[PDB]
Design an enzyme around this catalytic site. Structure first.
Site, PDB file in Angstrom:
ATOM      1  N   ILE A  10       0.798  -1.219   0.000  1.00  9.65           N
ATOM      2  CA  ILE A  10       0.000   0.000   0.000  1.00  9.65           C
ATOM      3  C   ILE A  10       0.833   1.272   0.000  1.00  9.65           C
ATOM      4  CG2 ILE A  10      -1.727   1.337   1.218  1.00  9.65           C
ATOM      5  CD1 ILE A  10      -2.792  -1.204  -0.028  1.00  9.65           C
ATOM      6  N   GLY A  11       1.925   1.263   0.755  1.00 12.35           N
ATOM      7  CA  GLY A  11       2.774   2.435   0.825  1.00 12.35           C
ATOM      8  C   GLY A  11       4.040   2.213   1.626  1.00 12.35           C
ATOM      9  N   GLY A  13       5.657   3.991   4.463  1.00 11.88           N
ATOM     10  CA  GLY A  13       5.620   4.980   5.526  1.00 11.88           C
ATOM     11  C   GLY A  13       6.972   5.469   6.017  1.00 11.88           C
ATOM     12  N   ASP A  79      -6.576   7.487   1.266  1.00 11.54           N
ATOM     13  CA  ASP A  79      -6.027   8.551   2.099  1.00 11.54           C
ATOM     14  C   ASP A  79      -6.509   9.894   1.554  1.00 11.54           C
ATOM     15  OD1 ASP A  79      -4.204   9.639   0.055  1.00 11.54           O
ATOM     16  OD2 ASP A  79      -2.902   7.935   0.487  1.00 11.54           O
ATOM     17  N   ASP A 120       3.693  14.206  13.185  1.00 13.01           N
ATOM     18  CA  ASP A 120       3.906  14.193  11.741  1.00 13.01           C
ATOM     19  C   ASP A 120       2.630  14.116  10.896  1.00 13.01           C
ATOM     20  OD1 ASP A 120       5.691  14.179   9.417  1.00 13.01           O
ATOM     21  OD2 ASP A 120       5.221  12.032   9.238  1.00 13.01           O
ATOM     22  N   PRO A 123      -1.437  14.919   4.766  1.00 14.19           N
ATOM     23  CA  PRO A 123      -2.562  14.343   4.023  1.00 14.19           C
ATOM     24  C   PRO A 123      -2.471  12.821   3.896  1.00 14.19           C
ATOM     25  CG  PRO A 123      -1.952  16.423   3.048  1.00 14.19           C
ATOM     26  CD  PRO A 123      -0.864  16.082   4.056  1.00 14.19           C
TER      27      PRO A 123
HETATM   28  N1  LIG Z   1      -3.318   6.395  -1.946  1.00  7.76           N
HETATM   29  S1  LIG Z   1      -4.484   5.311  -1.539  1.00  7.76           S
HETATM   30  O1  LIG Z   1      -4.457   4.291  -2.546  1.00  7.76           O
HETATM   31  O2  LIG Z   1      -5.720   6.010  -1.318  1.00  7.76           O
HETATM   32  C1  LIG Z   1      -4.132   4.452  -0.034  1.00  7.76           C
HETATM   33  C2  LIG Z   1      -5.105   3.399   0.353  1.00  7.76           C
HETATM   34  C3  LIG Z   1      -5.083   2.833   1.707  1.00  7.76           C
HETATM   35  C4  LIG Z   1      -4.116   3.344   2.694  1.00  7.76           C
HETATM   36  N2  LIG Z   1      -4.233   2.837   3.945  1.00  7.76           N
HETATM   37  N3  LIG Z   1      -3.300   2.551   4.710  1.00  7.76           N
HETATM   38  C5  LIG Z   1      -3.492   2.283   6.124  1.00  7.76           C
HETATM   39  C6  LIG Z   1      -4.658   1.604   6.737  1.00  7.76           C
HETATM   40  O3  LIG Z   1      -5.584   1.171   6.056  1.00  7.76           O
HETATM   41  N4  LIG Z   1      -4.489   1.557   8.089  1.00  7.76           N
HETATM   42  C7  LIG Z   1      -3.290   2.094   8.412  1.00  7.76           C
HETATM   43  C8  LIG Z   1      -2.650   2.270   9.731  1.00  7.76           C
HETATM   44  C9  LIG Z   1      -1.307   2.871   9.827  1.00  7.76           C
HETATM   45  C10 LIG Z   1      -0.650   3.340   8.577  1.00  7.76           C
HETATM   46 BR1  LIG Z   1       1.002   4.179   8.714  1.00  7.76          BR
HETATM   47  C11 LIG Z   1      -1.302   3.204   7.247  1.00  7.76           C
HETATM   48  C12 LIG Z   1      -2.625   2.558   7.214  1.00  7.76           C
HETATM   49  C13 LIG Z   1      -3.132   4.412   2.300  1.00  7.76           C
HETATM   50  C14 LIG Z   1      -3.144   4.964   0.948  1.00  7.76           C
END
Ligand SMILES: NS(=O)(=O)c1ccc(N/N=C2\C(=O)Nc3ccc(Br)cc32)cc1
Length: 282
Positions: A10-11, A13, A79, A120, A123
């Site tokens: 997903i990302g 961090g 997000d 921190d 968006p």
């Molecule tokens: N850019 S996007 O595709 O909308 C996208 C989609 C889902 C997420 N979700 N991430 C997260 C989620 O579901 N719960 C979390 C708890 C802590 C952290 Br640190 C990130 C998450 C982040 C970005």
């Protein structure tokens, strides 16, 4: 751990990569945060499991196996950063901005009363769902563990104050508030000094009048150029008077004069707050 099957990355961090994962047993979808282990960190993180609130992303489990540290959080599909991008052309409706802002302040009010800071906010750390809710993610991890974006960093941090307060989150929130309204980052700096200067050029260079003790900050330099304060109506059009009033209080230089989350919740700007449903495209 092998109890999960990493669906997708997903990302990436601050303290590791985040994955969408399915819990073999339960079958529930979760957000798996792989952190790349000190004793204090463990205890600190443990405390966060208790931090339950509707506007805080829930920390479900903490897996500390084989000297590895995995954090399992509830999963949300989008997000705020992506949502804003998708709304770049038409802009987010004011009622929705007002709703999201109100909910974020409730979350912060909750954390701050518990002496827990986010440190921190950005968006990317704000998650939303199909039901009009928004939640704060990564809360309290900063303290726990200790190109990054400086756009939302409060001035006291940039000036070297090491013992900052809850006020830093309000500053970050103010910057985000402005961004949603204008559809442009308020202070997009690309270095610490650049960040500081973009702040000074809009709010004016701080002095002992507006910020007592500022000249004694560790990184304060008498050689800082001295810019005049710009008019807020020019900075965040077309936000109404209530909104601009609320924003100016969130962007006060002096940490002590900056409005608290709780006091912000009683501001006139939120007299007509509602809870609209966003049209999300998953
Ligand atoms: N850019 S996007 O595709 O909308 C996208 C989609 C889902 C997420 N979700 N991430 C997260 C989620 O579901 N719960 C979390 C708890 C802590 C952290 Br640190 C990130 C998450 C982040 C970005």
């Amino acid at each position: 751990m092998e109890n999960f099957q990493k669906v997708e990355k997903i990302g990436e961090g601050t303290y590791g990569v985040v994955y969408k994962a399915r819990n073999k047993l339960t079958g529930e979808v979760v957000a798996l945060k792989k952190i790349r282990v000190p004793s204090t960190a463990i205890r600190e993180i443990s405390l966060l499991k208790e931090l339950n609130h509707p506007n805080i992303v829930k920390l479900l489990d903490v897996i500390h196996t084989e000297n590895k540290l995995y954090l399992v959080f509830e999963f949300l599909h989008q997000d705020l950063k992506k949502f804003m991008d998708a709304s770049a052309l038409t802009g987010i409706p004011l009622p929705l901005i007002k709703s999201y802002l109100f909910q974020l302040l409730q979350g912060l009010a909750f954390c701050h009363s518990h002496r827990v800071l986010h440190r921190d906010l950005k968006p990317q750390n704000l998650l939303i769902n199909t039901e009009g809710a928004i939640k704060l993610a990564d809360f309290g991890l900063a303290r726990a563990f200790g190109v990054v974006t400086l756009w939302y960093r409060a001035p006291e941090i940039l000036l070297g104050c090491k013992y900052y307060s809850t006020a830093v989150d309000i500053w970050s929130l103010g910057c985000i508030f402005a961004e949603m309204v204008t559809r442009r980052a308020l202070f997009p700096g690309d270095s610490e000094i650049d960040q500081l200067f973009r702040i000074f050029r809009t709010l004016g260079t701080p002095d002992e009048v507006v910020w007592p003790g500022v000249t004694s900050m560790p990184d304060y330099k008498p050689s800082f150029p001295k810019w005049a304060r710009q008019d807020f109506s020019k900075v965040v059009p077309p936000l109404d008077e209530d909104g601009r009033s609320l924003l100016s209080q969130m962007l006060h230089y002096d940490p002590n004069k900056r409005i608290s989350a709780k006091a912000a919740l009683a501001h006139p700007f939120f007299q007509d707050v509602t809870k609209p449903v966003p049209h999300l495209r998953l």
